[PDB]
Enzyme design. Sequence first.
Site, short mmCIF file in Angstrom:
data_model
loop_
_atom_site.label_atom_id
_atom_site.label_comp_id
_atom_site.label_asym_id
_atom_site.label_seq_id
_atom_site.Cartn_x
_atom_site.Cartn_y
_atom_site.Cartn_z
CG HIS C 202 -2.04 1.09 1.02
ND1 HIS C 202 -3.07 1.09 0.10
CD2 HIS C 202 -2.17 2.24 1.73
CE1 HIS C 202 -3.78 2.19 0.25
NE2 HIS C 202 -3.26 2.91 1.23
CB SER C 206 0.57 -3.03 -7.98
OG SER C 206 0.29 -4.19 -7.22
CE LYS C 228 -7.08 -7.35 -16.25
NZ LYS C 228 -5.85 -6.55 -16.53
CG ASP C 229 -8.87 -8.75 -8.66
OD1 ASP C 229 -8.07 -8.63 -9.62
OD2 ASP C 229 -8.58 -8.42 -7.49
CD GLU C 272 3.44 -33.85 1.65
OE1 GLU C 272 4.16 -34.87 1.49
OE2 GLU C 272 3.54 -33.11 2.66
C1 HEC Z 1 7.94 -14.51 -2.41
C2 HEC Z 1 7.10 -13.34 -2.48
C3 HEC Z 1 5.73 -13.31 -2.22
C4 HEC Z 1 4.86 -14.20 -1.66
C5 HEC Z 1 5.09 -15.67 -1.20
C6 HEC Z 1 3.58 -13.54 -1.58
N1 HEC Z 1 3.64 -12.31 -2.19
FE1 HEC Z 1 2.15 -11.06 -2.57
N2 HEC Z 1 3.35 -9.81 -3.52
C7 HEC Z 1 4.70 -9.97 -3.69
C8 HEC Z 1 5.27 -8.78 -4.27
C9 HEC Z 1 6.76 -8.46 -4.41
C10 HEC Z 1 4.24 -8.03 -4.70
C11 HEC Z 1 4.36 -6.82 -5.62
C12 HEC Z 1 4.32 -7.20 -7.10
C13 HEC Z 1 3.87 -6.04 -7.98
O1 HEC Z 1 2.70 -5.60 -7.83
O2 HEC Z 1 4.67 -5.60 -8.83
C14 HEC Z 1 3.03 -8.65 -4.21
C15 HEC Z 1 1.76 -8.18 -4.40
C16 HEC Z 1 0.63 -8.77 -3.89
C17 HEC Z 1 -0.72 -8.32 -4.11
C18 HEC Z 1 -1.27 -7.35 -5.16
C19 HEC Z 1 -1.80 -8.07 -6.41
C20 HEC Z 1 -0.69 -8.72 -7.19
O3 HEC Z 1 -0.77 -9.96 -7.39
O4 HEC Z 1 0.26 -7.98 -7.58
C21 HEC Z 1 -1.49 -8.96 -3.20
C22 HEC Z 1 -2.95 -8.74 -2.85
C23 HEC Z 1 -0.66 -9.98 -2.61
N3 HEC Z 1 0.63 -9.87 -3.07
C24 HEC Z 1 -1.14 -10.95 -1.74
C25 HEC Z 1 -0.40 -11.99 -1.20
C26 HEC Z 1 -0.96 -13.04 -0.38
C27 HEC Z 1 -2.40 -13.00 0.17
C28 HEC Z 1 0.02 -13.98 -0.26
C29 HEC Z 1 -0.04 -15.26 0.34
C30 HEC Z 1 -0.97 -15.71 1.35
C31 HEC Z 1 1.20 -13.44 -0.92
N4 HEC Z 1 0.93 -12.21 -1.46
C32 HEC Z 1 2.44 -14.06 -0.99
C33 HEC Z 1 5.44 -11.07 -3.28
C34 HEC Z 1 4.95 -12.16 -2.60
C1 LIG Z 2 5.69 -27.49 14.06
C2 LIG Z 2 6.52 -27.40 12.79
C3 LIG Z 2 7.62 -28.17 12.56
C4 LIG Z 2 8.20 -29.19 13.51
C5 LIG Z 2 8.47 -28.15 11.37
C6 LIG Z 2 8.08 -27.83 10.11
C7 LIG Z 2 8.95 -27.16 9.13
C8 LIG Z 2 9.62 -27.75 8.12
C9 LIG Z 2 9.53 -27.31 6.67
O1 LIG Z 2 9.54 -26.03 6.14
C10 LIG Z 2 8.48 -25.24 6.53
C11 LIG Z 2 9.40 -28.53 5.71
C12 LIG Z 2 7.93 -28.63 5.30
C13 LIG Z 2 10.41 -28.48 4.44
O2 LIG Z 2 11.00 -27.24 4.27
C14 LIG Z 2 12.36 -27.35 4.21
C15 LIG Z 2 9.64 -28.94 3.16
C16 LIG Z 2 10.26 -28.40 1.86
C17 LIG Z 2 9.58 -30.47 3.16
C18 LIG Z 2 10.78 -31.19 2.66
C19 LIG Z 2 10.60 -32.69 2.70
O3 LIG Z 2 9.29 -33.18 2.75
C20 LIG Z 2 9.04 -34.57 2.78
C21 LIG Z 2 7.73 -35.12 2.82
O4 LIG Z 2 6.63 -34.33 2.85
C22 LIG Z 2 7.57 -36.52 2.84
O5 LIG Z 2 6.27 -37.05 2.89
C23 LIG Z 2 6.18 -38.42 3.12
C24 LIG Z 2 8.66 -37.40 2.81
C25 LIG Z 2 9.94 -36.92 2.77
O6 LIG Z 2 11.03 -37.77 2.74
C26 LIG Z 2 10.73 -39.13 2.83
C27 LIG Z 2 10.20 -35.49 2.74
C28 LIG Z 2 11.57 -34.95 2.69
O7 LIG Z 2 12.56 -35.69 2.66
C29 LIG Z 2 11.68 -33.50 2.67
C30 LIG Z 2 13.07 -32.93 2.61
#
Ligand code: HEC
Ligand SMILES: C/C=C(C)/C=C/C=C/C(OC)[C@@H](C)[C@H](OC)[C@@H](C)CCc1oc2c(O)c(OC)cc(OC)c2c(=O)c1C
Lengths: 53, 385, 385, 93, 93, 245, 125
Positions: C202, C206, C228-229, C272
Site C-alpha cells: 500500500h 503495485s 477484472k479480479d 507432496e
Molecule cells: C515470495 C514473495 C511473495 C509471496 C510468497 C507472496 N507475495 Fe504477494 N506480492 C509480492 C510482491 C513483491 C508483490 C508486488 C508485485 C507487484 O505488484 O509488482 C506482491 C503483491 C501482492 C498483491 C497485489 C496483487 C498482485 O498480485 O500484484 C497482493 C494482494 C498480494 N501480493 C497478496 C499476497 C498473499 C495474500 C500472499 C499469500 C498468502 C502473498 N501475497 C504471498 C510477493 C509475494
Molecule cells: C511445528 C513445525 C515443525 C516441527 C516443522 C516444520 C517445518 C519444516 C519445513 O519447512 C516449513 C518442511 C515442510 C520443508 O521445508 C524445508 C519442506 C520443503 C519439506 C521437505 C521434505 O518433505 C518430505 C515429505 O513431505 C515426505 O512425505 C512423506 C517425505 C519426505 O522424505 C521421505 C520429505 C523430505 O525428505 C523432505 C526434505
Amino acid sequence: SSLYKTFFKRNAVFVGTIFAGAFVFQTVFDTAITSWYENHNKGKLWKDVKAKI
Amino acid sequence: MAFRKSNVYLSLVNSYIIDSPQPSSINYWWNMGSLLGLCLVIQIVTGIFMAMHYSSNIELAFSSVEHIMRDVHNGYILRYLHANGASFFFMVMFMHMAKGLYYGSYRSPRVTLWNVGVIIFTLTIATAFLGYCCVYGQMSHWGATVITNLFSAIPFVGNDIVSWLWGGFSVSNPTIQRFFALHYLVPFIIAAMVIMHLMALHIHGSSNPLGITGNLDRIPMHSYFIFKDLVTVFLFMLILALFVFYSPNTLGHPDNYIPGNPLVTPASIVPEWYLLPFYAILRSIPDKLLGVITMFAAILVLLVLPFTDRSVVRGNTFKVLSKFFFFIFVFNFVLLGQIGACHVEVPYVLMGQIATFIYFAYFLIIVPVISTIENVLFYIGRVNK
Amino acid sequence: MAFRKSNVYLSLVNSYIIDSPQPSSINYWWNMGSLLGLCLVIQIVTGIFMAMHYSSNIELAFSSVEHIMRDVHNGYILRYLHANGASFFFMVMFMHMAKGLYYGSYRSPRVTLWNVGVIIFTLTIATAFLGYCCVYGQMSHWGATVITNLFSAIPFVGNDIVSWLWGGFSVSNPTIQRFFALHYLVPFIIAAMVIMHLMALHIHGSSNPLGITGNLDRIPMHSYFIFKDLVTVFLFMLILALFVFYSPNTLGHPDNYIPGNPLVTPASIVPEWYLLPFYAILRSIPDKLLGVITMFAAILVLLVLPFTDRSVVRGNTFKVLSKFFFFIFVFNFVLLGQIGACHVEVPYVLMGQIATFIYFAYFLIIVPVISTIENVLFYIGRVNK
Amino acid sequence: GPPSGKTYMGWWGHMGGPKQKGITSYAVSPYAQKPLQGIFHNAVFNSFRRFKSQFLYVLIPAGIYWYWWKNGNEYNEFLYSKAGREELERVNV
Amino acid sequence: GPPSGKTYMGWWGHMGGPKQKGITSYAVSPYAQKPLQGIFHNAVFNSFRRFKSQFLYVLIPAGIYWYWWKNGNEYNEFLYSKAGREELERVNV
Amino acid sequence: MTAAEHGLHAPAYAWSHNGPFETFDHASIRRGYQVYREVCAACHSLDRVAWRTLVGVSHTNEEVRNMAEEFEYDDEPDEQGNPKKRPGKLSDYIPGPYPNEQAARAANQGALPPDLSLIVKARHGGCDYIFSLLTGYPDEPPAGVALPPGSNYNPYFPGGSIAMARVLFDDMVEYEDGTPATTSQMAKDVTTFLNWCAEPEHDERKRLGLKTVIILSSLYLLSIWVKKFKWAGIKTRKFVFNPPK
Amino acid sequence: QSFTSIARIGDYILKSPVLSKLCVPVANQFINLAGYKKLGLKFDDLIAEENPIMQTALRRLPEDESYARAYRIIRAHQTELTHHLLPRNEWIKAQEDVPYLLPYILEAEAAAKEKDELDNIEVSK
Ligand code: HEC
Ligand SMILES: C/C=C(C)/C=C/C=C/C(OC)[C@@H](C)[C@H](OC)[C@@H](C)CCc1oc2c(O)c(OC)cc(OC)c2c(=O)c1C
Ligand code: HEC
Ligand code: HEC
Ligand code: HEC
Ligand code: HEC
Ligand SMILES: C/C=C(C)/C=C/C=C/C(OC)[C@@H](C)[C@H](OC)[C@@H](C)CCc1oc2c(O)c(OC)cc(OC)c2c(=O)c1C
C-alpha cells in the site's frame, strides 16, 4: 550511595550485567527457598518418613 | 525524521505505545485496558499450550484435562492459570466497564468505541461458555444444555436452531467437539475486535477524570504510562499468582470434578460467578420467552446510554446525585449476583425482581431524570437574570 | 467529504479496495494476489468446519477423517475442497512468486514487501505440512518423522530439539495432537503476515508490466480491478471444482489412505507434489547436514535477489538475455521437482545435482553477470560520444 | 493515503486546543529531587482525604444494600426453620 | 495522527508524478459502444501475435529441458533391463 | 431451605497441610493407602491414580512394584491371538473392584460408589467434609426420621440419608508404624491420602507459589518506586499565569 | 440536552418566588458540594466541547476570556494529577463562577434552530 559508584560508577546497570546476574539468582534463590521449605516441613516429607523405615 | 516514525511497521507502534498523546491527569482506572490486553494474551497462550494435550471427544474430554492436570509437566499451572485467568478477565472487564459508566466515556465522540466494547463483552461471555464446556464436568454439560436451549425460545425455527447447535438429539460428542473448535476460533475474533476498539480509541484519544478537554496538556504514552501500566501489571500478576498457587479452586464449582452425566442434574447446579447477575435476571421473569428476552435486553440496554444521559457535562466527578445513584447501580448489580447464587425461595424471588427493575430503571429512568435535574440545578445555582 | 472516506473502518476498506490508485497497464498476473486471499479463506473456512468433526487422538485421527468423508453431510466436499484447495494454494503461490521474480517486483522500494512474502512462503509450507500430518495416513506418519528429524542435523542440541517436538520417543499421540493444535494456530499468523504484506504494498502501490512508474496514469481499484479480479476468481473456482468433484484424489498420494504404521515405511513414499523440488535438492547432497543446509538455503536464497540484480531497469519485458534465462530457471525448477518424484537411480542423481547447481547459480551468477552485460549492451548500442 | 474525517485531537504541534498565551511552566529534573519522599510527614495526613469526601456516596448505598440482604436472608433462615414452618406454608405457594 | 516517510506514490490530486501539460485524452461511454465485438475481424488476427514473439523464449528452454529429461530417462529404463544389466553393474557403484 | 437438606456444616479440623507453607504429612498419606486398600477399596475405585505416582511419595519403588504385581491386567494376545493376562506394573492404574457400573450397583443395594480420585475436590468442605462424613455416623437416626430400607442416616450428607453404611471401626486395621488405628485416626489418614490422590501437585505447587509471590511482590514494590521517579518531573511541576495585554 | 432548554426551565423557576425560594438554596448547596470551584474552575469550563455548537461558541469567545479559560483547565489537570486541591484562597469564589460562555452558546443554538427550520419550511398556496 557510594556502593553504587564503586561497582557501576553512576552509569545504569548494563543489560549484559543484568542477564548474567539473572542466572546466578535463579539457582541461588531457588536453593534457598527449597531449603527453608523442606526444613519448615521436617517430619512430614518423604525423605523423613523413608528414614523411619 | 526518526526511524520509529518513518518505518511502515514501527510507526504504528510509535503512535500507539510511544508518542501517543495522553491527558496528564488520567488516573489508574485507565490502567484497566492494558490489563484486559494481558488477559487475552495469557488466555490465548495458556490455551494453545493445553490444546496440545486436550481431546474434544466426549469420552476422553474430562480425562484429558485430568491428564493435563497430572501427567503434563507444569500442566496444573497452565490449567489453574487459564481457569483463574478467565475469572480475572471478567473482574477487570467489569471494572473497565464501570470506569466507562462513571466517567461518561460512552458519550462524547467515543460512542463507536463503546458500541464495539459491548460487542466484545458479548463475544467474551460466549467464548468463556464454550471453553467451560470443554471440561465436560457436571456443570459443563448442564450449562451446555441450558444455554443452547436459550434458543428454543425463538418462535418457530427455535427447536431446529437447537438440535442444529447440538448436532444431535441432545448435548453429545458432536456438541463438545464443535464447541472446542469454536472455543479456539472466537478468541482470535476477539483480538480482531480489540484492534477496532483501539482504532476508535485512537482517533479521539482517551478521556480523563475531569470530563473536559485534555488537548491543553498532554504527555507521551512512553516514559510514563508504560511505567505506570507496569505497576498495575505486576499487582495484577501478584494477586493472580495467589489464586493460581494457593487457592486454585476457590473461584470454581466442585461439581465440575465429576464427569458430565445426561441423566442427572446436580441439585447444587450453579453458574460460574461472573454470569450470576444475568442468570439472576432470567430467573426473575416467570415465563420462558420473556426471561430470555429480558436477559439479552439486560446486556443490550448498555447501548442506550449515550442517549438517555441528558447531561451537558461529561462524567460523574462533579455530579452529586449521579455519584449516589451510580453506586446504587453498582451494588444492585452485586446484590443481583448474590441472588442468582441463592435458591428460588420466598424472601429472594421478590428481591430478584425488584433488583432487576432497578437495573433497567437506572438506564431508562434514573439517568435521564437525574441528569436533567442536575442540569437545571447547575443553571439556577449561579444565574441571576 | 464522503462517508466511505470519513468513517474510521470504511476509509481503510476504501483506500485499499475502492479508491486505491492502480497502474492502468497491469496484466492478469496481478490477479494472483486476490486469488491467494481467496485461498486463505477457503482453507480457513473449510478447516474450522471440518474441525468440528476431527479427533487429533492418534487412535481416532485417521478414522475421524473418514467419518468426515462418510458420515458428515457434504463432509467429502469439505475434505476434498480443503485438500485440493491446499494444492491450488501452491500452484497460485508459485505463479504469484514467479510474476514478481520476472517483473522485478522484489526490487526498488518493494524489498520489504518481497521479504514479508518470503516469510509467508516458509510459513505456508509449514502450515501445510502440519495439516498433512493430521490425517495420520502412511505418508502422514513418515512425513511427520522425516521432517522433524531435519532438526536432528543441528550439531549439539539436535536430538533434543527432535524429541522435544515429538514429545516422546517417536512420532506418537503427543506429536499428532500438538500438530493439530499448531495447524489451527499458524493460519491466523499467516493472516496477520498478510496484512503486513498489504501494508508494505500500500505505500508504493503495485508495479506494472513496463517496469516503469505508474504515477502518470492511474485508475481506481473499484469498478475495473474489482471486476477484472472476478474473472479469475470464477476461472479459479471452475478448475478447483473440476478436481474436487470429478478428480478429488489425482493430486494426492494413495498411501495416505492406509493408516499410518510405525514399523513399515512404504517403498512408495513420495512427498507432496509442491514439496518435490525442495525434496530433490536435499537428496542431491550425499551429506546429512549439508543436505538440510542446502535445502533451507534454496528458500533463503530468494532474499538475495534485490542485491544480485544489477540491472538499471526493472523487469524482464525488454531484456532478451534475461527472459531467456528466466525460463531456463522455470523449467529447471520443474525438472527439479520431476527428479524428486523419481528414484535415486544413476542418470537422475547426477541430473538432480546439475539442476541444483543451476538453481542456486541463477540468483548468484547468471542474473548479476547477465544484467551487467545487458546494462552495457543497452549503453553502447546507442551512444556516439 | 487519502485524507480522513476531522476529529477532536491532532498530534504534537497541532493538538487542536486553544491558542495558549501567558501560561508559563517551570519544572525540575527527577535526578535533582529528594530520593522519593513525600510519603509520610507531608502527604500522610493529605492521603485518605479522598474517600473521606466520596465515602458517603459509597457507604450509604452499600449500607442500604447490605442491610436489605441481611434482613432478607434472616427471613429465609426463619421460614425454613421449625418455628416459621407455619408461616412458610402461608407465603410459599 | 503523526507524519510518515516519503513514499514514491501519493494519492489522487498529488500522485507524485511529473507536471503534465499538452496531453489531451478523449474517451467514449461504454454505453455508446457496439455490444462487445472486437474479437473476430479486428482483434482475432491481432491476438496470439502476443506469444509469437515470446514463444521462442519459452520454447527453447522448454525444448532443452524436455530433451534432457526424456533422454536420461531412457537411459534409466535401459540400465534396469536385461540388455543393460552389464552397463548397469558398471555405472552403478 | 431446611437444614436437614443443606446438610450439617462440616467443622474446621486442623489439617497438618492447611497452610501456604505446609506440605502434606506423607507419613499420614502412607497409612492412608492402607486404610484404602483394606477397607475402602472393596467398593471404591481409584481409576485416575497410576501405581508409579506412589513411588517417592508414600512408598518405595519395590513396595509399589509389589502391590501392583498382585493384580492381573490384559496383555497382548499370543501367537494365535488368544487373550492372556499379566501381573501389574508401575505404569498401570489401580484396578477397581467392579468391572462395570451394572455390577457395582448390584453389590450395593442399587447405589453407585463414586471413584474417590477427585472426591476431596468434588465436594464442598473437602478434607473437612470427607472426614466429618466418615466419623459422624450416629448410632441411631434422630426422632421422627423415617429411613428408607437399606439406607443409613448421617447428618453431614445432604438430606441426611446416605446409601453407604458405616465402615470405620476401632482397631480394624493394623498400622505398620504402630499407630493406634482408632476409627478417627484412620479417617484422618484416608482423607489425607484421598487429598494427595486428588491434588498430587500439592507440595510442589505451594513451593513455587512461595517463589512467585516473593518475586512478583518485589517487582510490584520496585515498580511503584520506579514509576514515582519517572513521574517526578510532572508531579512537582508548577504553572504561573500572566494575562496578556 | 440543549441550553436553550436548560435556560427555559431554569428561568421559569428563578421567576416564580415560590419555586425560587425553594430551589436556589438546594442549587447553591448542590454546587458547593460538586467541588469544581475547589479546582479553580468555573462551571462553563466543564461544558463538554466536542460538538459543533460548543466549538462555534469557544471560537467566538473574546481572546482574553479564552487564554484565561486555557489556564484554568491546565491548572485543573495539574492539581488533579497531584491529587490535591488548590490552596483555599485560589478557589473560584461564587461571584467569579459566572456563565461567561453561555450567551455565545444560546446564540449559536437558536441560530442553528432557525437554519434547521428554514431548511424544512413548507409552502402553502
Ligand atoms: C515470495 C514473495 C511473495 C509471496 C510468497 C507472496 N507475495 Fe504477494 N506480492 C509480492 C510482491 C513483491 C508483490 C508486488 C508485485 C507487484 O505488484 O509488482 C506482491 C503483491 C501482492 C498483491 C497485489 C496483487 C498482485 O498480485 O500484484 C497482493 C494482494 C498480494 N501480493 C497478496 C499476497 C498473499 C495474500 C500472499 C499469500 C498468502 C502473498 N501475497 C504471498 C510477493 C509475494
Ligand atoms: C511445528 C513445525 C515443525 C516441527 C516443522 C516444520 C517445518 C519444516 C519445513 O519447512 C516449513 C518442511 C515442510 C520443508 O521445508 C524445508 C519442506 C520443503 C519439506 C521437505 C521434505 O518433505 C518430505 C515429505 O513431505 C515426505 O512425505 C512423506 C517425505 C519426505 O522424505 C521421505 C520429505 C523430505 O525428505 C523432505 C526434505
Ligand atoms: C461399599 C459397601 C462401601 C465401602 C466399604 C465404602 N463405601 Fe464409600 N460409598 C459407598 C456407597 C453406597 C456410596 C454412595 C453414597 C450415596 O448415597 O450417594 C458411597 C459414597 C462415598 C462417598 C461419597 C459421599 C457423597 O457425598 O456422595 C465418600 C466420600 C465415600 N464413600 C468414602 C468412603 C471411604 C473413604 C471408605 C473407606 C473407609 C468407604 N467409602 C467405604 C459404599 C462403600
Ligand atoms: C486452544 C486455544 C484456547 C484459547 C485461545 C482459549 N482457550 Fe479456553 N480452553 C482451552 C482448553 C484446551 C480448555 C480445556 C482445558 C481446561 O479446562 O483448561 C479451555 C477451557 C476454558 C474454560 C474452562 C475453565 C476450566 O478450566 O474449568 C474457560 C472458562 C475458558 N477456557 C476461557 C477462555 C477464555 C475467556 C479465553 C480467552 C478468549 C480462552 N479460554 C481462550 C483452550 C483455549
Ligand atoms: C482447524 C482449522 C484448520 C485450518 C485453519 C486449516 N486446516 Fe488444514 N486441516 C484441518 C483438518 C481438520 C484437517 C484434517 C482433515 C483433512 O484431511 O481435510 C486438515 C488437513 C490439511 C491437509 C491435509 C490434506 C489432506 O489429505 O486432506 C493439508 C495439506 C492442509 N490441511 C492444509 C492447510 C493449509 C495450507 C491451511 C491454511 C492456509 C490450512 N490447512 C488451515 C483443519 C484446518
Ligand atoms: C462496553 C465496555 C467496554 C468493554 C467491554 C471494553 N472496553 Fe475498552 N474502552 C471502552 C471505552 C468506552 C473506552 C474509553 C475510556 C476512556 O478513556 O474514557 C475504552 C478504552 C480502552 C483502552 C484504553 C485504556 C483505558 O482503559 O481507557 C484500552 C487499551 C481498551 N479499552 C482495551 C480493551 C480491551 C483489550 C477490551 C476487551 C478485551 C476492552 N477494552 C473492553 C469500553 C469498553
Ligand atoms: C456457539 C455459541 C452458542 C450456542 C451460544 C452461546 C451464547 C450464549 C450466551 O451469551 C454470550 C450466554 C453465555 C448468556 O448470555 C445471555 C450468559 C449470561 C449465560 C447465563 C446463564 O448461564 C448458566 C450457566 O453457566 C449454568 O452453568 C451451570 C447454568 C445455568 O442454568 C442454571 C445458566 C443459566 O440459566 C444462564 C441464564
